[PDB]
């Protein structure tokens, strides 16, 4: 619920995710990327199950790779589950999609998986 | 286009996505196949389609499916505007079942 | 159907898949958009579509793209038989770039 | 090349994969599953880049979940790269597809990632 999720997290590549879980199931924050065309901080928005069922808490968020300094013409979404305890982790799968011409659309989307550790 | 995106859309199975695209890159609206709140972002200065993504947690006042889907794709405008997507649906699971927690698929939305 | 699967198929972009389905569950054949060898398996006793998958390493006598695609899906027979798939294309990369090694997409093949 | 790949491997869930890499780029072997409707050994087939480029070697394989004892009406494909050294590993992403009725086709496919360690 709010506090579990709210906080600073890092993935296995050294990117940072700062998130506030709101009472209505809203997720807002900032993302700072360890890779790609990514310079500085980017806004993030998402949603989580604010009334979860030993099972994890399902959540997802999106970043569009545009800030006041750069624009990668691409957006990533991460879908996963928050698993609490002392070992708090967020286990995700993500899709990165770039804006493409129609011809190149077949190769517009990357897929990968990230694990977030809470700090 | 910002307000190119703004509107009501439908996918292949009859689900309906109502969205507003903000000047600064925000997407907000509701998804129904009952109704759920969505939030996302899009490139507000595209070159190419416009990249975008959004999430829906499957909980509202009536049901809680303890899952959340994210759609990642691009908007292509023109005479017949479309949003081509791939999505990941993750369910809250115990550790024993975490390996079978995520479904993947694709959706094509149109104004029709 | 074993020999329901056997035949020549085309996807949305004009690639052509020539396949033979063996009695015991083997798939063999070639894929061309030049030609590459494919191998896979399918459920030879289906209930529902027939589950199946195949791989193509993108190397032949003429080119080597140092990648390999796998297609996972099901065969649906009837008047207009189709093979609905999702695929993963992985490229051989250095460790620095391993996070951007895999493309995901979907393909629909038909006899037309 | 052949020998690098050829051998016995296990994933993080305790499944086993026994594979022989052939000279023409063929992969044949057997898979024994730690989960699902999966009883005993199942045949596998796939392909690999027999002439790879510090970069890994791209490969993929499929198992249909049918043997003489069980049938799950489903097939999985794993796509990834073999990374050699002492730390030999195969890093993959997989798609599991079940045979479904048309109505249920939207939820026929699972996605996940596995890491294989050589034994």
Curated annotation (Swiss-Prot), chains A, D:
GO terms for cellular component: extracellular region. Its main location: secreted. The keyword Cell division does not apply. Biotin binds at residues 31, 42, 78, 94, 106. Coiled coil: none annotated. Keywords: Biotin, Secreted, Signal. Residues 1-119 form the Avidin-like domain. GO terms for molecular function: biotin binding. The keyword Transcription does not apply. A motif (Cell attachment site) lies at residues 47-49. It is found in: Secreted. The biological function of streptavidin is not known. Forms a strong non-covalent specific complex with biotin (one molecule of biotin per subunit of streptavidin). Belongs to the avidin/streptavidin family. Homotetramer. This is Streptavidin. It comes from Streptomyces avidinii. The chain holds residues 37 to 157 of 183 of the full protein.
